[PDB]
Amino acid sequence: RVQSGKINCGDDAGWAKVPSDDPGRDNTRELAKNITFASPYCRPPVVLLSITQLDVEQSQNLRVIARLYSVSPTGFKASCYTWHNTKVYSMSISWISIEN
Amino acid sequence: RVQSGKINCGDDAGWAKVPSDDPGRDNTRELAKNITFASPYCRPPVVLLSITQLDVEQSQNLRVIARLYSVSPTGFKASCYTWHNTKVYSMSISWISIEN
Amino acid sequence: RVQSGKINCGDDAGWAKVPSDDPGRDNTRELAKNITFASPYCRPPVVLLSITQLDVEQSQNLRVIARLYSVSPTGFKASCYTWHNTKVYSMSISWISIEN
Amino acid sequence: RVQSGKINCGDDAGWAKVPSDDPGRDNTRELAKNITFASPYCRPPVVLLSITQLDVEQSQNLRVIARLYSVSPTGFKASCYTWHNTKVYSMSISWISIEN
Amino acid sequence: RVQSGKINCGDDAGWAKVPSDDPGRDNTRELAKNITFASPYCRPPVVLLSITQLDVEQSQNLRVIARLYSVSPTGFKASCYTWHNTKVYSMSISWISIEN
Amino acid sequence: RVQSGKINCGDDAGWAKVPSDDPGRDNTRELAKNITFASPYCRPPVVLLSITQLDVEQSQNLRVIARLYSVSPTGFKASCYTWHNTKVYSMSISWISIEN
Ligand SMILES: CC(=O)N[C@@H]1[C@@H](O[C@H]2O[C@H](CO)[C@H](O)[C@H](O)[C@H]2NC(C)=O)[C@@H](O)[C@@H](CO)O[C@H]1O
Ligand SMILES: CC(=O)N[C@@H]1[C@@H](O[C@H]2O[C@H](CO)[C@H](O)[C@H](O)[C@H]2NC(C)=O)[C@@H](O)[C@@H](CO)O[C@H]1O
Ligand SMILES: CC(=O)N[C@@H]1[C@@H](O[C@H]2O[C@H](CO)[C@H](O)[C@H](O)[C@H]2NC(C)=O)[C@@H](O)[C@@H](CO)O[C@H]1O
Ligand SMILES: CC(=O)N[C@@H]1[C@@H](O[C@H]2O[C@H](CO)[C@H](O)[C@H](O)[C@H]2NC(C)=O)[C@@H](O)[C@@H](CO)O[C@H]1O
Ligand SMILES: CC(=O)N[C@@H]1[C@@H](O[C@H]2O[C@H](CO)[C@H](O)[C@H](O)[C@H]2NC(C)=O)[C@@H](O)[C@@H](CO)O[C@H]1O
Ligand SMILES: CC(=O)N[C@@H]1[C@@H](O[C@H]2O[C@H](CO)[C@H](O)[C@H](O)[C@H]2NC(C)=O)[C@@H](O)[C@@H](CO)O[C@H]1O
Ligand SMILES: *[C@@H]1O[C@H](CO)[C@@H](O)[C@H](O)[C@H]1NC(C)=O
Ligand SMILES: *[C@@H]1O[C@H](CO)[C@@H](O)[C@H](O)[C@H]1NC(C)=O
Ligand SMILES: *[C@@H]1O[C@H](CO)[C@@H](O)[C@H](O)[C@H]1NC(C)=O
Ligand SMILES: *[C@@H]1O[C@H](CO)[C@@H](O)[C@H](O)[C@H]1NC(C)=O
Ligand SMILES: *[C@@H]1O[C@H](CO)[C@@H](O)[C@H](O)[C@H]1NC(C)=O
Numbered sequence: 001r002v003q004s005g006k007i008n009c010g011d012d013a014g015w016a017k018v019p020s021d022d023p024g025r026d027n028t029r030e031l032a033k034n035i036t037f038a039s040p041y042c043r044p045p046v047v048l049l050s051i052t053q054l055d056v057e058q059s060q061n062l063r064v065i066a067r068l069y070s071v072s073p074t075g076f077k078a079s080c081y082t083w084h085n086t087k088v089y090s091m092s093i094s095w096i097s098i099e100n
Numbered sequence: 101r102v103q104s105g106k107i108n109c110g111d112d113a114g115w116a117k118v119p120s121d122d123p124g125r126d127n128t129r130e131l132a133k134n135i136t137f138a139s140p141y142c143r144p145p146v147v148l149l150s151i152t153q154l155d156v157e158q159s160q161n162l163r164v165i166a167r168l169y170s171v172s173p174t175g176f177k178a179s180c181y182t183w184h185n186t187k188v189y190s191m192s193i194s195w196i197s198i199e200n
Numbered sequence: 201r202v203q204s205g206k207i208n209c210g211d212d213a214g215w216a217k218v219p220s221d222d223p224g225r226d227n228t229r230e231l232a233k234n235i236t237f238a239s240p241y242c243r244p245p246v247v248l249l250s251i252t253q254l255d256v257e258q259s260q261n262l263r264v265i266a267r268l269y270s271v272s273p274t275g276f277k278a279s280c281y282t283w284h285n286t287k288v289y290s291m292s293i294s295w296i297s298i299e300n
Numbered sequence: 301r302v303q304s305g306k307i308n309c310g311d312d313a314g315w316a317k318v319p320s321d322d323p324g325r326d327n328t329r330e331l332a333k334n335i336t337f338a339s340p341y342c343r344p345p346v347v348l349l350s351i352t353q354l355d356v357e358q359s360q361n362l363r364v365i366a367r368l369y370s371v372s373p374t375g376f377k378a379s380c381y382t383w384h385n386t387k388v389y390s391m392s393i394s395w396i397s398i399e400n
Numbered sequence: 401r402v403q404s405g406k407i408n409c410g411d412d413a414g415w416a417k418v419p420s421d422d423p424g425r426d427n428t429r430e431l432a433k434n435i436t437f438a439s440p441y442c443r444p445p446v447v448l449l450s451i452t453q454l455d456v457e458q459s460q461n462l463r464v465i466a467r468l469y470s471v472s473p474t475g476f477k478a479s480c481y482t483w484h485n486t487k488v489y490s491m492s493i494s495w496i497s498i499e500n
Numbered sequence: 501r502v503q504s505g506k507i508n509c510g511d512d513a514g515w516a517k518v519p520s521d522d523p524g525r526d527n528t529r530e531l532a533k534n535i536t537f538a539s540p541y542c543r544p545p546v547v548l549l550s551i552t553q554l555d556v557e558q559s560q561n562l563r564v565i566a567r568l569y570s571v572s573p574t575g576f577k578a579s580c581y582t583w584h585n586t587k588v589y590s591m592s593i594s595w596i597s598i599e600n
């Protein structure tokens with residue numbers, strides 16, 4: 001089975017401050033959603049992430065990641081991620097999950 | 101079967117004005133292509149969209165969507181989408197279609 | 201089998217100057233990696249590219265491509281690609297490869 | 301999808317006389333069932349037949365066929381088939397259907 | 401994944417007497433093996449049975465079944481089965497297991 | 501891909517004498533065909549054999565095998581096989597080949 005979805009992170013005011021894991025980045029924020037597959041897999045599927053909606057402040061550098069932390073048979077943790085003075089007004093991440 | 105392609109939307113001068121479906125957005129334009137699978141499916145495939153070419157005006161906010169309206173067994177309607185004063189000089193959307 | 205990976209291109213100082221293949225573009229640079237599938241295919245798989253990390257200079261236009269040159273049963277050549285005065289500080293391309 | 305089933309033809313007293321299509325065979329009888337897949341295919345699946353229950357008269361030659369006439373996306377016509385003076389007391393045909 | 405194997409039941413002297421579950425059959429014997437898939441499934445696969453070696457006494461009726469009791473994600477119970485005065489000197493059952 | 505076919509061995513007069521590989525069998529004959537897949541595989545497929553047509557002399561013991569020697573990506577050697585005084589007038593072996 002193959003499943004797909006869409007993660008609307010929205011404004012980064014609702015995103016949480018998280019502690020940087022890259023020493024050259026600070027003020028790292030992150031909308032980290034925790035997804036559950038409608039129809040579970042029993043072996044962890046391969047997941048691809050895609051950014052398909054961006055609304056970023058022009059006066060300041062575009063800093064975004066569509067981050068993919070982990071993948072289990074039941075679901076996956078992924079996030080919209082930005083850092084420093086960059087301002088995200090909108091970020092969506094559509095994704096896919098395939099067996100093997 | 102799995103099929104893939106690429107939608108080159110180009111300059112947004114050729115994109116059409118379309119009526120906003122989000123009340124906080126205006127001047128919504130859209131290059132909405134209508135794709136047909138080379139080898140048809142008989143059940144609608146799962147489609148993922150990806151943005152893989154961006155050329156956007158720096159003086160004004162990055163506003164883009166790789167929108168996916170609908171998916172049939174024969175094809176799918178999807179679009180490059182921008183709004184307000186944002187200026188897109190170039191947007192490509194490469195995509196994939198898998199069975200299930 | 202389905203395989204996935206991630207290409208971190210990094211700063212465009214390490215990207216090479218390459219000769220433009222589009223007459224309206226100049227100063228075309230490119231981090232062109234050459235990937236090898238862990239478990240080979242015997243027929244060329246369908247590959248999708250996705251941009252999942254961008255860090256671009258705000259004072260100058262966003263110009264990027266996640267380019268996909270060729271796909272063999274053994275691997276594929278793809279690249280982060282920018283042109284003119286645009287400055288990329290960071291670009292990642294996560295990808296997927298499926299049979300057929 | 302893959303589907304399987306089982307056709308119990310039973311005693312050949314209930315099998316019909318049918319006209320021989322092989323000139324070296326006569327008294328050709330046949331229990332010809334007409335199967336319908338639970339979950340339809342949209343392209344005709346590959347079907348394999350197997351004989352998995354035989355109960356044949358010892359005094360006379362073993363003459364049986366697990367015949368596979370046709371395969372559609374909706375189902376298939378197949379039959380237990382015997383000829384001449386052979387006496388079948390019992391014949392089952394378990395089968396399988398796979399996509400492609 | 402698809403797995404296959406082969407069950408050599410051998411002479412029916414080693415087959416066990418089992419109590420008939422069909423009132424018109426007696427002296428029912430059965431070589432009932434209990435198979436384990438090399439690489440487990442997590443949903444029960446579709447299994448087909450095939451008889452591919454028979455060595456039966458000519459003086460007495462051919463009575464055999466390639467019986468398929470149950471199928472789990474881990475394996476399946478199946479058997480060579482004969483009844484009454486029939487004498488099996490040799491019966492093999494080759495089988496296949498496919499996902500879905 | 502999945503492929504299927506059918507091997508009609510016919511009368512055992514055309515079958516060759518071959519040297520027994522089982523010390524308890526003699527006068528071993530064999531119609532050993534050498535099959536080639538229409539659309540090659542690049543890894544050896546799993547093959548199942550099935551006997552689906554038998555026409556055997558009643559006065560003498562039923563001795564048959566649907567033998568499967570080897571499987572390559574290009575095809576497979578399999579055979580109708582009988583031994584001792586058994587007389588086969590007709591044996592067909594329908595088969596299937598699936599990827600993995
Ligand atoms: C190019 C550069 O290093 N500019 C610094 C700026 O660094 C921040 O922005 C750059 C690229 O725009 C990278 O994203 C860095 O990761 C990021 N650093 C941090 C700690 O977030 C800052 O150092 C800024 C404030 O000192 O000075 C700029 O000139
Ligand atoms: C942050 C904000 O609301 N700025 C407004 C601007 O809103 C437009 O741009 C923002 C983010 O850049 C969103 O994309 C909105 O969807 C968009 N609104 C519309 C109607 O297109 C405009 O309201 C602008 C003109 O009044 O004022 C800015 O300050
Ligand atoms: C909109 C435009 O053509 N501006 C030109 C600029 O063209 C460059 O940037 C645009 C969009 O930002 C395209 O990406 C072009 O491909 C790119 N051209 C080249 C040759 O790289 C330059 O021509 C610039 C210098 O003459 O003038 C701008 O006004
Ligand atoms: C060996 C033979 O031809 N015996 C014939 C018998 O033929 C019948 O049985 C054989 C094998 O057992 C084949 O199955 C033939 O297809 C079948 N023929 C028919 C018409 O059904 C009969 O011809 C029989 C009656 O004349 O004579 C036997 O000796
Ligand atoms: C044709 C028939 O019923 N013959 C009976 C025989 O029945 C046995 O064999 C037949 C077919 O060969 C079926 O397999 C039956 O299932 C089987 N019955 C049993 C109880 O095993 C016996 O009844 C036999 C002894 O009374 O008489 C034959 O004539
Ligand atoms: C039951 C038995 O061993 N009978 C023998 C017979 O053996 C042949 O037939 C049996 C079963 O019907 C097996 O198929 C053996 O494999 C087969 N042996 C050979 C060498 O082909 C013969 O030994 C026969 C001639 O001596 O005597 C029977 O009683
Ligand atoms: C979902 O995300 C949170 C935030 O990181 C994490 O701590 C939690 O364990 C996750 N929940 C699940 C379903 O695993
Ligand atoms: C393709 O797109 C247009 C524009 O929205 C739509 O109206 C039309 O029905 C579509 N054509 C097909 C092939 O369905
Ligand atoms: C990898 O990329 C380089 C740069 O274009 C190319 O010339 C080379 O042939 C490629 N190597 C492989 C493994 O094909
Ligand atoms: C089923 O079998 C009969 C007997 O041959 C045939 O005539 C009929 O058309 C079949 N029905 C279907 C469902 O096609
Ligand atoms: C295998 O077969 C025996 C005999 O019927 C059965 O009782 C036993 O539970 C089976 N073992 C497994 C692995 O389930």
Ligand SMILES: *[C@@H]1O[C@H](CO)[C@@H](O)[C@H](O)[C@H]1NC(C)=O
Nearest residue numbers: 532533534535536575576577
């Ligand atoms: C086919 O069968 C013959 C007989 O055993 C064998 O010797 C030969 O090598 C086979 N041919 C192919 C195509 O491998």
